[PDB]
Design a protein around this ligand. Structure first.
Ligand SMILES: Nc1nc2c(ncn2[C@@H]2O[C@H](COP(=O)(O)OP(=O)(O)OP(=O)(O)O)[C@@H](O)[C@H]2O)c(=O)[nH]1
Ligand SMILES: Nc1ncnc2c1ncn2[C@@H]1O[C@H](COP(=O)(O)OP(=O)(O)CP(=O)(O)O)[C@@H](O)[C@H]1O
Ligand SMILES: Nc1nc2c(ncn2[C@@H]2O[C@H](COP(=O)(O)OP(=O)(O)O)[C@@H](O)[C@H]2O)c(=O)[nH]1
Ligand SMILES: Cc1cc(C(=O)Nc2ccn(C)n2)on1
Ligand SMILES: Cc1cc(C(=O)Nc2ccn(C)n2)on1
Ligand SMILES: [Ca+2]
Ligand SMILES: [Ca+2]
Ligand SMILES: [Mg+2]
Ligand SMILES: [Mg+2]
Ligand SMILES: [Mg+2]
Lengths: 350, 438, 51, 421
């Protein structure tokens, strides 16, 4: 009888995993503080990694990788890419980004300003965006408004180049982002969930007005609140891979695999492979796995850009059942076996 | 030459001390009857090994050690074991009833009755020391004597030997090789009262020593013999600088200078390699680069933690055998570009390297294979604070219900001393958090 | 990769490699106060037994 | 040299104490004449804990037989092993106790107790370092119950820093001698709460169930019930009588087993309970089973504060851990979570006589309150009508003392009640 605990009472994903475990009759759930567990579904913040793997006779597995926040924090990702050689500062698939601390508190203000001045000095597009992990986003083309917006906040803010030429879905002349659910098992095998979702914008894109952020931010919550065309084109502003792969063919004479998925798969490998020697639990006294939520941007040239990596992502309503079961099959049963894979293994060198 | 006095308290301390002095005699060529054919200074001399061994006119080489326990069973083994001819009966001190895994019993009730006899026996060893460096205190955390009597002895040694260093070799409680439930209390109680009296403490988690025995030595269910035969290898690596010629860690003070920049954070993490099963007829000999890189695999740490999520304040590489500086520096570079070695800002990023040419000595008919080169890495990492977290947590689970508290209050200790010690451990964790986290 | 303080002898050598520079009176009052609490504890155990 | 002083009081106490000395004498290789004929040093390594060393290399049990009538100790002396006991350590009267706690505690027992303490004092004085005392007795009778607790009451006054443990046989209507057994047991329990470090609860009802159902014994006798008690007592003392990493003294065992001073009543269990070898998975699954326990309390109704398991014989300690873990995971919700690692395992190389391997269970469970609840209900059933009280008030007892014992028992049930939620 395998045992597990539930310490994050908000994870919609692992609330389904928990239910699936009990459905096997071979998993017993304990109290959130019982130390005799095989698998821990830990809390988001301040997860007590230092107490894992110290129970005699118990193999213990946790649904998080200690140190993966370096990839899932706004400022942390930019610093990780700029400092990491595997990614380098000339990283082609990450928008130009600078870490800006509020003045009431290293800082890249001057570096960003020189980059800004060089653009305006050359007539180039100069639309930037300011955002932070505690969000509160601002789209502006004036280096002043963006910097002053950050000084009005008390946490670390990031400013990156705003993609002014995004791929627009027709009809609608609208924007969108791609969400790819990734899973890294205890062996560090990088599995990409075959199914993704495009969180679409129900408002036409207007490059001459960045103040109305409803046609520029493709967040599912922004569209369902301030956008008045929600669910018009697709249900819940969610376009799934089968339909979007069909639009890319009829509209652009290409496929989701060639035009986008190849880069999405390459960007996932490059990031996870970069932080392997720091978060891997190969010879560790406990095992880690984790489900990541990658967010991509696609410009009009069919170039994929990484926006951010989410370490605690939800899931599309239509995809919970399929994805949660795969987590149990690749991430859990692989360690605690019972009595066509929905993923795509991204081969790499450990 | 300055001397070192070894003090072994309780069953854990005493049995570990038995394995260490065995290895010391083998390493220095000292026969079980205390003779040393190579020593040409008969009854005297100020050589490196004389820091751990005095000499009688009869040429016998007597360890500078005291064994103390509250029950006689474990010390009686030494009185008749193989090396019974090394120790004088005065160096072996025993009571009649132990501390029953009760710190209060070992510190107050029974301890107060034997403390002055131990100090007198220690003073007698000091009287033979022209320049005493200090003491090495071997003991367990979870025992009633190793925890309760050690801290009392440590309090007293500070008063009588103020200017003397005191290093600890502590056994951290692992539930798989122990049959107690009050060990969280005893550990925090003794760590609380011993912190300001120990200049440097090398903890060894039985859980880590145990897994090494199962994994590398292929021992299904290891015994204390297997555990201590390995612990002695590590202890030998750490004290070899004091018993042989050299320039690194030449006296007990240099241990603090090179490993402990902050007085409270004096718990260096030990990492040893290689550990090869002797049953293996032929095992390939690892290179400086291969053993050096093993000092960063968790499975070779005396305490299981993750240095990738801590900050180093110091790091020592103690090599034994066929190791040349050229190959060490080379491997040190290869490990910076591939390893997460994040020092603290107010400290240089470097390594103090010591090389002794004599390879690790193996005990005849033991568990360890004969290797051509070994290394012990002492590093002061904030990841060892994981060990305090585990311990403090267990302490908190019992102390919330006051479970077992009556056994301690009943032996004179006050209940306030519990939370007083716990508040200190909390401050100790808080100090580790400041130095290694941003 | 600087090597400092290279000390060599017959049984070995040591050095340091730097990669990057930095960016009684009261002891009896507690042993006696606990002995008086044991005396007082057994003083109530005997008086209890006298009743 | 950690000597234990053994004391058996009354009929049940002396009969249970007799089989005990009969059993461990065989384990240590001591014949009924005190001569050692064993073949292992493990038998003599820690033999001095229950046996004195006499002239001619004889081994005399450090035991003291007490009773208020001569019948039972005539049997012990006339028995085969009876010749092993010290002739001077037989201390008995002639009046009998009449299955009356008052006669054992206040009147007849009061007249004899001082002489018993002279024999105890004679044994203690020749002790290099006394661990403490163990008493075998029943709680439903008059001598072992009334005088047994009176003995303990005076041993603590004279040995306040020694361990005082008892093997207390609890009465059951299923195996009852008289209707006043609830009175005698209620009066003894309160004494046990105040003056014993550990009390092993041996319920005759659970012993009858074990003999009847599991052991398939039609009409169980007292000797049938005692064979189990012998096997259990041999087990819960293995960590004492034998050397190795498991050797400890009473105090150390109590320190790790008793988290609260008054909740020191243990549930013992044994296994196996026909020539079929018992695979490690079989020993361990019964050892935690209620049908294998000797306190007639359902573990699933309370919660475990501490638990010990002594495995005797030769087997794979690796297989034990795996099966032990499986038992813990199936009953995870029953062990308190605020005592880390509260289930320990020990091994002894010497198996009991004629068994490849056995398992002895020692549980500190809050389910033990069922036992005290039965006693309490039975007590009140008679006391509400004041039935049979004249046997006690004739010995100089008052009703008030019964009311106080009823309250003290209930308070005990409530104290166990808090630590179960
Ligand atoms: N590594 C190692 N650990 C040991 C050894 N002996 C005991 N221990 C550990 O020490 C702890 C028990 O404390 P002891 O040292 O046996 O107790 P003590 O110091 O003699 O004090 P008392 O309670 O009075 O006996 C347990 O956690 C054991 O696992 C040993 O020989 N080697
Ligand atoms: N550099 C950039 N260029 C174009 N659009 C951008 C952008 N940075 C952010 N966006 C827009 O912002 C939205 C996502 O913002 P971001 O992901 O930083 O906030 P967030 O982290 O709170 C959402 P989530 O964490 O759920 O993915 C996307 O829909 C995208 O359209
Ligand atoms: N298990 C067991 N119980 C007994 C034995 N003898 C008596 N009893 C129980 O003890 C109670 C009677 O007490 P008893 O020992 O005869 O009183 P005493 O001799 O005056 O101390 C009854 O509840 C009996 O069931 C015995 O040999 N074995
Ligand atoms: C005589 C005697 C023995 C004990 C006792 O508690 N023994 C224990 C406890 C745990 N184990 C393994 N053995 O009490 N009276
Ligand atoms: C609960 C629980 C049970 C025990 C136990 O039997 N402890 C033993 C047995 C032998 N020694 C030396 N210690 O400790 N905690
Ligand atoms: Ca000071
Ligand atoms: Ca009379
Ligand atoms: Mg947001
Ligand atoms: Mg001991
Ligand atoms: Mg009778």
């Amino acid at each position: 009888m395998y045992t597990f605990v539930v310490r994050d009472e908000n994870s919609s994903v692992y609330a389904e995993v928990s239910r699936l475990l009990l459905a096997t009759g071979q998993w017993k759930r304990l109290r959130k503080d019982n130390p005799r567990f095989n698998l821990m579904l830990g809390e988001r913040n301040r997860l007590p990694f230092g107490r894992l793997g110290h129970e005699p006779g118990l193999v213990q597995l946790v649904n998080y990788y200690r140190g993966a926040d370096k990839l899932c924090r706004k400022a942390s990702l930019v610093k990780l890419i700029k400092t990491s050689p595997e990614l380098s500062e000339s990283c082609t698939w990450f928008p130009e980004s600078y870490v800006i601390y509020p003045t009431n508190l290293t800082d890249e203000r001057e570096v960003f300003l020189a980059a800004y001045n060089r653009r305006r000095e050359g007539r180039e597009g100069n639309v930037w965006i300011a955002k932070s992990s505690a969000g509160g986003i601002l789209i502006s083309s004036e280096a002043s408004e963006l910097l002053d917006f950050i000084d009005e906040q008390g946490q670390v803010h990031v400013i990156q180049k705003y993609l002014e030429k995004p791929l627009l879905l027709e009809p609608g002349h609208r924007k969108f982002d791609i969400r790819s659910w990734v899973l890294v098992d205890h062996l560090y095998n990088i599995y990409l969930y075959r199914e993704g979702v495009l969180r679409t914008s129900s408002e036409p894109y207007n490059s001459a007005n960045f103040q109305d952020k409803t046609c520029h931010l493709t967040n599912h919550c922004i569209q369902k609140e301030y956008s008045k065309n929600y669910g018009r084109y697709e249900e819940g502003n969610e376009m799934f891979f089968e339909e979007f792969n069909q639009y890319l063919m009829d509209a652009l004479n290409t496929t989701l695999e060639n035009s986008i998925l190849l880069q999405i798969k390459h960007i996932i490998r490059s990031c996870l492979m970069c932080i392997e020697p720091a978060i891997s639990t190969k010879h560790l006294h406990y095992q880690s796995f984790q489900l990541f939520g990658f967010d991509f941007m696609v410009d009009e040239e069919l170039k994929v850009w990484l926006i951010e990596v989410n370490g605690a992502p939800a899931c599309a309503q239509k995809l919970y059942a399929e994805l949660c079961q795969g987590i149990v099959d690749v991430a859990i049963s692989s360690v605690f076996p019972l009595a066509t894979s929905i993923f795509i293994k991204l081969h790499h060198h450990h | 030459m300055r001397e070192c006095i070894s003090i072994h308290v309780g069953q854990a301390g005493v049995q570990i001390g038995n394995a260490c002095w065995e290895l010391y005699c083998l390493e220095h060529g000292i026969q079980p009857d205390g003779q040393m054919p190579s020593d040409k200074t008969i009854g005297g001399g100020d050589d490196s090994f004389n820091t751990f061994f005095s000499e009688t006119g009869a040429g016998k080489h007597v360890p500078r050690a005291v064994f103390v326990d509250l029950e006689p069973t474990v010390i009686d083994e030494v009185r008749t074991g193989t090396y019974r001819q090394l120790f004088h009966p005065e160096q072996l001190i025993t009571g009649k009833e132990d501390a029953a895994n009760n710190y209060a019993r070992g510190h107050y009730t029974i301890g107060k009755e034997i403390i002055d006899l131990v100090l007198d026996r220690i003073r007698k060893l000091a009287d033979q020391c022209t320049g005493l460096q200090g003491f090495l205190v071997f003991h367990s955390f979870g025992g009633g004597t190793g925890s309760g009597f050690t801290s009392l002895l440590m309090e007293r040694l500070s008063v009588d030997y103020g200017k003397k260093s005191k290093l600890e070799f502590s056994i951290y409680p692992a539930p798989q090789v122990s049959t107690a439930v009050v060990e969280p209390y005893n550990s925090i109680l003794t760590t609380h009262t011993t912190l300001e009296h120990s200049d440097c403490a090398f903890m060894v988690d039985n859980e880590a020593i145990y897994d090494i025995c199962r994994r590398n030595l292929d021992i299904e269910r290891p015994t204390y013999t297997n555990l201590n035969r390995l612990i002695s290898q590590i202890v030998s690596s750490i004290t070899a600088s004091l018993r042989f010629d050299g320039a690194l860690n030449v006296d007990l003070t240099e241990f603090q200078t090179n490993l402990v920049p902050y007085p409270r954070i004096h718990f260096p993490l030990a990492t040893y390699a290689p550990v090869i099963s002797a049953e293996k007829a032929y095992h390939e000999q690892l290179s400086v680069a291969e053993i050096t890189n093993a000092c960063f695999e968790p499975a070779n740490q005396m305490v299981k933690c993750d240095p990738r999520h801590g900050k180093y304040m110091a790091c020592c590489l103690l090599y034994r055998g066929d190791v040349v500086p050229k190959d060490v520096n080379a491997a040190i570079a290869t490990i910076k570009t591939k390893r997460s070695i994040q020092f603290v800002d107010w400290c240089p990023t470097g390594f103090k390297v010591g090389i002794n040419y004599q390879p690790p000595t193996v005990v005849p008919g033991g568990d360890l294979a004969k290797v051509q080169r070994a290394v012990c890495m002492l590093s002061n990492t904030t990841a060892i604070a994981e060990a305090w977290a585990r311990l403090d947590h267990k302490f908190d689970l019992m102390y919330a219900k006051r479970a077992f508290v009556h056994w301690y209050v009943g032996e004179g200790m006050e209940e306030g001393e519990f939370s007083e010690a716990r508040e200190d451990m909390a401050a100790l964790e808080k100090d580790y958090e400041e130095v290694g986290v941003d | 990769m600087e090597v400092i303080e290279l000390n060599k002898c017959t049984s070995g050598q040591s050095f340091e490699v730097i990669l990057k520079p930095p960016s009684l009176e009261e002891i009896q009052k507690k042993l006696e106060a606990a002995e008086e609490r044991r005396k007082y504890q057994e003083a109530e155990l005997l008086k209890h037994l006298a009743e | 040299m950690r000597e234990i002083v053994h004391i058996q009081a009354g009929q049940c106490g002396n009969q249970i104490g007799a089989k005990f000395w009969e059993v461990i004498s065989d384990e240590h290789g001591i014949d009924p004449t005190g001569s050692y004929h064993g073949d292992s040093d493990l038998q003599l390594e820690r033999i001095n804990v229950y046996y004195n060393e006499a002239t001619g290399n004889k081994y005399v049990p450090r035991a003291i037989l007490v009773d208020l009538e001569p019948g039972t100790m005539d049997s012990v002396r006339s028995g085969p092993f009876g010749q092993i006991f010290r002739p001077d350590n037989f201390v008995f009267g002639q009046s009998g106790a009449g299955n009356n706690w008052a006669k054992g505690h206040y009147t007849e027992g009061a007249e004899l107790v001082d002489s018993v303490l002279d024999v105890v004092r004679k044994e203690s004085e020749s002790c290099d370092c006394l661990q403490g005392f163990q008493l075998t007795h029943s709680l439903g009778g008059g001598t072992g119950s009334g005088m047994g607790t009176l003995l303990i009451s005076k041993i603590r006054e004279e040995y306040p820093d020694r361990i005082m443990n008892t093997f207390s046989v609890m009465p059951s209507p299923k195996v009852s001698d008289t209707v006043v057994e609830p009175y005698n047991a209620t009066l003894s329990v309160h004494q046990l709460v105040e003056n014993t470090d550990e009390t092993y609860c041996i319920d005759n009802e659970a012993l009858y169930d074990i003999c009847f159902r599991t052991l398939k014994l039609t009409t169980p006798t007292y000797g049938d019930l005692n064979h189990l008690v012998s096997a259990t007592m041999s087990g819960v003392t293995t960590c004492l009588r034998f050397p190795g990493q498991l050797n400890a003294d009473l105090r150390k065992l109590a320190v790790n087993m008793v988290p609260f001073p008054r909740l020191h009543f243990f549930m013992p269990g044994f296994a196996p309970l026909q020539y079929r070898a018992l695979t490690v998975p079989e020993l361990t699954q019964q050892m935690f089973d209620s049908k294998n326990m000797m306190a007639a309390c359902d573990p699933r109704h309370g919660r475990y504060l501490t638990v010990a398991a002594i495995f005797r014989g030769r087997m794979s300690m690796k297989e034990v851990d795996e099966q032990m873990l499986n038992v813990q995971n199936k009953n995870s919700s029953y062990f308190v979570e605020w005592i880390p690692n509260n289930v320990k395992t020990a091994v002894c190389d010497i198996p009991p006589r004629g068994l490849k391997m056995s398992a002895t269970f020692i549980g500190n469970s809050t389910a033990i309150q069922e036992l005290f609840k039965r006693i309490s209900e039975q007590f009140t059933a008679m006391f509400r009508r004041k039935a049979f009280l004249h046997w006690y008030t004739g010995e100089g007892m008052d009703e008030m003392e019964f009311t106080e014992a009823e309250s003290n028992m209930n308070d005990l049930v409530s104290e166990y009640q808090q630590y179960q939620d």
